[PDB]
């Protein structure tokens, strides 16, 4: 009686996001999780932001990964300051900070995941 979730992703609305964001871990799974995890492969998102600047009441981590280092690059806007992230990278967005990301470069198999940390 293993617990398996395959009805994925779970689309959930997130502030300032044009479309519901694709979640792979949500806070209610498996009796309750201390994180939520959303994101996707970036190869078709180059130049196309998924959201306008937005604020969360929880910390969010951007996790940028690609098969080979350097194959993915995003620009993170953090309270009006721009930061370039190169795969592999993890960036913490403190709760209350206005932020969003723009994909600069991405191969097939490049991902950015946003990990909401449950406080």
Site residues (CB under 6 A) for ligand 3IO? 21-22, 38-41, 44-45, 50, 112-114
Phi and psi, residue 31, nearest 5°: 80, 5
| Residue 53 in contact with a copy of itself, rule: CB under 8 A | no
Give CA–CA dist 10/22, Å, rounded. Answer: 6
Stretch that binds a copy of itself, among 12-20, 47-55, 73-81 (CB under 8 A): 73-81
The radius of gyration computed from the CA coordinates of the chain, to the nearest angstrom, equals 14
Least gap, CB of 1 to Fe ion (angstroms) = 19
Q: Which residues in the 44-83 window bind Fe ion by CB under 5 A?
A: 60
Q: 99 φ, ψ to 5°?
A: -165, 165
Positions that interact with Fe ion (CB under 5 A): 60
């Amino acid at each position: 009686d293993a617990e398996i979730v395959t009805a994925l992703p779970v689309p959930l609305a997130v502030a300032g996001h044009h479309q519901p964001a694709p979640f792979y871990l949500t806070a209610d799974m498996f009796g309750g999780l201390p994180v939520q995890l959303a994101g996707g492969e970036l190869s078709k998102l180059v130049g196309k932001p998924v959201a306008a600047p937005h604020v969360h009441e929880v910390d969010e981590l951007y996790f940028l990964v690609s098969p080979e280092p350097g194959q993915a690059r995003i620009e993170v806007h953090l309270d009006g300051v721009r930061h370039e992230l190169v795969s592999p990278a993890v960036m913490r967005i403190p709760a209350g900070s206005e932020h969003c990301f723009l994909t600069l470069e991405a191969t097939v198999g490049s991902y950015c995941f946003g990990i909401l940390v449950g406080d």
